[PDB]
Design a protein around this ligand. Sequence first.
Ligand code: DB8
Length: 266
Amino acid sequence: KDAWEIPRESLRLEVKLGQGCFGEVWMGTWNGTTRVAIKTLKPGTMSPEAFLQEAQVMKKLRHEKLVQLYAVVSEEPIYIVTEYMSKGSLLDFLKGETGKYLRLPQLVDMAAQIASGMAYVERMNYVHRDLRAANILVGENLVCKVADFGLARLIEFPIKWTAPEAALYGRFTIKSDVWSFGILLTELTTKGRVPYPGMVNREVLDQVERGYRMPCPPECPESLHDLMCQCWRKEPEERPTFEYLQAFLEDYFTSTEPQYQPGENL
Ligand SMILES: COc1cc(Nc2c(C#N)cnc3cc(OCCCN4CCN(C)CC4)c(OC)cc23)c(Cl)cc1Cl
């Protein structure tokens, strides 16, 4: 065991946030001072080793725009402990009561933050492999953080968010994350709508390999849809870096859309 271990007794669960087929997620407190999120093991439901690989990844990654690992407890019951993101997933946020008030300036900034965290992922030679709005967490002041590193891996599957070469041939790279980032941009510009509306998984894969790409979202400026389409280039190496994405989105309203006016929804 390493320096991430803590004593269970210093963890107290309070408020339930969700369950799955491996355990649960609770709000809670740490050493009676610090608000945390705790992720639990339904003890015999899965191999605790592989249940903690999500923490092994989080130990190595540390960035302001990635959700921070706080501690692990490697003896049953088992926990992972992280900072607490007050507004939950970005997906829920966008669909929620606030989502409708968000306009393009806020959505591009959020996407800029996510790109910033992924740019870090990029230069660390990792791939996330599950980038999408459901796996971005939100705090106050519209802070967005990449989360859920379950499938994340040092570089050595829902087709809607996954690049083709990765879904078909298992070729996951930082460039298939770039693809997913392009899909995530349509989640932001639609306030959370599922991609490829009205298409089932098979139709998505068939159409995407046939060159089909989602059209420009209502009120989304074409320059932002260009960006999406660059993220969705057939050739992975011709997709932009997270470094380009971050800088492009940070400067967006001066360098690309200086004449932007708000409309009905964006
Ligand atoms: C601990 O370990 C892990 C925890 C997580 N997941 C979370 C992390 C992290 N990280 C941080 N913060 C979280 C906050 C949540 O909900 C906040 C309250 C919801 N409300 C919506 C309605 N409004 C009005 C009140 C707020 C939440 O809900 C499910 C999950 C969280 C992941 Cl993904 C992986 C690991 Cl290993």
